[PDB]
């Protein structure tokens, strides 16, 4: 396999389906990436994450650099070996969670909840972890942001994108074996989104993320910004919408040209009692499920829906049992993978617009 | 398969190995029974509990009757169906955890941490859960106990053993499909142990538990009491030592004629960071393991020791991650099953005394 090859197999309007080939495996797009916080997808062994259909997971740089430490993970063989996941890993840059502190043009210094993160250090940590898809280090633009602040922050992020590119390229083993994605900023402002897209394409990346959304703006606004923002990115490279999340957000974002997603929702939701179904989310802790012998979802093909009832899962979550977290998280990540598979097949078959309409009619019935 | 058949295949001194055949499966003895509290072996799917080699698990009556409720579990199809374990389940009587309240000769009334438990109600709950091995309801004798108190309590327990026998026999489906074990009491006093054994054998049970030990008396005392107590039980029925536990306690107890064990140690220990090894227990949270790439135990055949290092498990437990509990509990229960398998093979081969000596020399090196 090549270091990185994105191929588009089918299109329907702005939606695309295809594959990213990398040394550790093929990623089917549109893709959903389960999030590994602290070198684990919560409550799942890697083999179970793979069994749900995930082709790649996301590792959070911020957490790893605090615990267990990036240099420590490198000494032990890298993140893949440490956690037992041998397929591609995308790592974030660590900066978002820094904000979630002294900031300057060099980078940010912060106290662990004393550390430093610059574009160079972020790319180095992602190298030490052995990441396959490395994210450029950007500056977070809060929502809402004034035009002036959004512009200053976008400009700093483009300076840091060039620094990230040069740091990644300076390290032979990383340049030869991993891919580097740039992140578009500009808040909700079309002209800044355009300047950001132009700058990132001038520098050149393997893929392009749409940053700064899912920050409180609401779905209509998010979709309006995607409407003009995604077409500004190079068409022939993957488009990654960072931190997006809800099933309906994913369907609308695919309709607008997005190829990759991550979110903690299905894992975090799981442990909190929220289960996704084709008829909308349910909260399994609700007393109405205490004697319900049906599976979480009537159509879901996951091992949890094969084997255990809503009533059992209700009891486990109400009792605070670990197996309740395990079962809820496996089902929710399987549900997301089945959604992505339905999206991919419907685009491949030229019936994605109908699928989106059918999905919305039922999910919101 | 028959309702209940215990066959002894080999003996070495007081140690025996053999099988209990029941309708839901065969139990290899000496047996260790993982404990399911609240209708789950903590942090393990049933298929994983089975993969470790367990032939039967223990369900705690007290917890189940509070949450989710015995009548509720019966309405949903019984405990096997509810939790997805289709092999034998032994249920305790619920009384111990009641103590762990108004007591009388009829039974005990208590407030959930308002309920009632008598011999009749306990046998009924175990029926509603669909237990395969039902324990008679006894009265707990605290350690230490005076001779007079231990005698009064033992006598009450023998009265309740007859009540348990008659309640179990009055229910056709339970009498035909499950087995009933009696519990010997008498604290540390030989004459009371003998009177208790005589009473239980007069009533007649499918198996006999040694109750009231592992209550603070220490291993030398426990072993001294087993020395005279176990020979008082019918030789041709299984002998169950309730709530025993540590690997060395199990080896010594088998040397004294015990065939069945349960304890929360390997599960509870797991989540707390204690991992069993042939060289003794380790606490994985210790900093000495932070860069240790060896598996938890160098000889262990479990899936955790195949796949993950001490360093990774150290990180997961220190980070409070669910997968750390999952991996530690799977390894510890697998370790217990491998211990029982080594015990069974060594008795079968007439080399159990040597095995016990070799085990002690290394476990305590
Ligand atoms: N580096 C970075 N991480 C992120 N996570 C979620 C969002 C939005 C985001 C971003 O805009 N930038
Ligand atoms: N019913 C009962 N349960 C028990 N668990 C642990 C011990 C000891 C015990 C007992 O002596 N009786
Ligand atoms: Zn499911
Ligand atoms: Zn092991």
Numbering used by the authors:
A (entry chain A), B (entry chain A): 11 to 110, 115 to 127, 132 to 383
Sentences from the paper on this structure:
Bacterial Tgt functions as a homodimer in which the protomer consists of a (βα)8 barrel harbouring a Zn2+ binding subdomain close to the C-terminus. Hence, in an attempt to generate a model system for the active site of human Tgt and to gain insights into the relevance of particular amino acids for substrate base selectivity, we adapted the Z. mobilis Tgt active site by site-directed mutagenesis in order to mimic that of the human enzyme.
Also the electron density maps of the Tgt(Val233Gly)·queuine and Tgt(Cys158Val/Val233Gly)·queuine complex structures enabled reliable placement of the 7-deazaguanine scaffold of the ligand which is, in both cases, similarly bound as in the Tgt(Cys158Val)·queuine complex. In both maps fragmentary density is visible for the dihydroxy-cyclopentenyl substituent (7H as well as 8F, 8H). Figures 7F and 7H show that the mutation of Val233 to glycine results in a considerable gain of space in the substrate binding pocket which allows the dihydroxy-cyclopentenyl of queuine to occupy the cavity located between Gly233 and the side chain of Cys/Val158. Within this cavity the dihydroxy-cyclopentenyl apparently has no specific interaction with the protein. The crystal structures of Tgt(Val233Gly) and Tgt(Cys158Val/Val233Gly) with queuine reveal that the Val233Gly exchange allows the dihydroxy-cyclopentenyl substituent to occupy the created cavity between position 233 and 158. The adopted binding mode of queuine will not interfere sterically with the sugar-phosphate backbone of bound tRNA. Yet, the results of the trapping experiment suggest that Tgt(Val233Gly) is also not able to bind queuine after the formation of the covalent enzyme·tRNA complex. Even in the case of the mutated variants where reliable placement of the scaffold into the binding pocket was possible the electron density within this area appears rather fuzzy or even patchy and lacks detail. It is likely that multiple conformations and the low occupancy (on average 60%) of queuine in the binding pocket provoked the poor electron density.
